[PDB]
């Protein structure tokens, strides 16, 4: 048999949500910035021996359309909360996403993974320990990724599936 998971990629504009998604789906790094409105992708994978159909909703990094945002969060089962390690504001935004997801889904326990992207770049402004401490305070995984080198890309998405499965067990 198989099981389907609705994954939603959220985070400030430019952090690499689409580049991460395109690496997962198409196995190449988009060097250019093509700003997202909204895109959906699907991919069948095996995670921990169990066949999964992944639905990936790649959202735009914007804060203007709250009715759409709320619906994204209602439908999504797990959230990849992405910041860029060279963008402190994007890291400071993270707690807002968690607060919104918990409110929309009426739960203190929503599957999510904190993703620190662009770890190939030499211009870091957010320390790994800062992000690890925030993730630990939420009880969620933290993964450093580079959509450019593909480091951590599969791990970020697969860990999110693992988090959804752990939540469904409760």
């Amino acid at each position: 048999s198989m099981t389907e998971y609705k994954l939603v990629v959220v985070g400030a504009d430019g952090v690499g949500k689409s580049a991460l998604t395109i690496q997962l789906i198409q196995n190449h790094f988009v060097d250019e910035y093509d700003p997202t409105i909204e895109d959906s992708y699907r991919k069948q994978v095996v995670i921990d021996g169990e066949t999964c159909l992944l639905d990936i909703l790649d959202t735009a990094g914007q804060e203007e359309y709250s009715a759409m945002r709320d619906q994204y969060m209602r439908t999504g089962e797990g959230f990849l909360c992405v910041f860029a390690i060279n963008n402190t504001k994007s890291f400071e935004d993270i707690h807002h996403y968690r607060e919104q997801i918990k409110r929309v889904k009426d739960s203190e326990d929503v599957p999510m993974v904190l993703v620190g992207n662009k770890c190939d770049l030499p211009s870091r402004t957010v320390d790994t320990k800062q992000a690890q401490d925030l993730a630990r305070s939420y009880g969620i995984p933290f993964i450093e990724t580079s959509a450019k080198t593909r480091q951590g890309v599969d791990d970020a998405f697969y860990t999110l599936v693992r988090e959804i499965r752990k939540h469904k067990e409760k």
Partner: protein, 166 residues
């Protein structure tokens, strides 16, 4: 108009002529922003809209264009420098044909702009309205049909020619 300049775009679809859209630019109420668009339409500063693309067209909302620096929806520049401040919010996004500046947040006007195809009142106070379609709203409606929900166009919509009338 006795006061406001009129500019035109000749729109192309995959290089083929679609038709002409003309705009009244509200220099009477939004002079700095109107003047930027006028001068980018004539090219008189040595750069401007001729050849650029309407890269994002979302039916029911707007046709957005004007990135002649990066040619990918991320760029553009004004006649005052890369960016200029939000001049005023006197005018609102009251319906189809409204011409308004695209931006990346407060005080980031460059050259990108959008033509509303519906009322977009949630943009009031966040984007500077500075003009309106005068003639050729049917051409804008034809352009809108090449758009899609995510903004990607099914054929490439460009400003084949542009300039000032009257």
């Amino acid at each position: 108009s006795m006061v406001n300049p009129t500019v035109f775009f000749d729109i192309a679809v995959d290089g083929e002529p679609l038709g002409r859209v003309s705009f009244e630019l509200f220099a009477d109420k939004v002079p700095k922003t109107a003047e930027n668009f006028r001068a980018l339409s004539t090219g008189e500063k040595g750069f401007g809209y001729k050849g650029s693309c309407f890269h994002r067209i979302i039916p029911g909302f707007m046709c957005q264009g004007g990135d002649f620096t990066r040619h990918n929806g991320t760029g553009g520049k004004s006649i005052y420098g890369e960016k200029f401040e939000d001049e005023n919010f006197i005018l609102k996004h009251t319906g189809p044909g409204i011409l308004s500046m695209a931006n990346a947040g407060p005080n980031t006007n460059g050259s990108q702009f959008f033509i509303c195809t519906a009322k977009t009142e949630w943009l009031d106070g966040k984007h500077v309205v500075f003009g309106k379609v005068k003639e050729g709203m049917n051409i804008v409606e034809a352009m809108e049909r090449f758009g899609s929900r995510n903004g990607k166009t099914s054929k490439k919509i460009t400003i084949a020619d542009c300039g000032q009338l009257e």
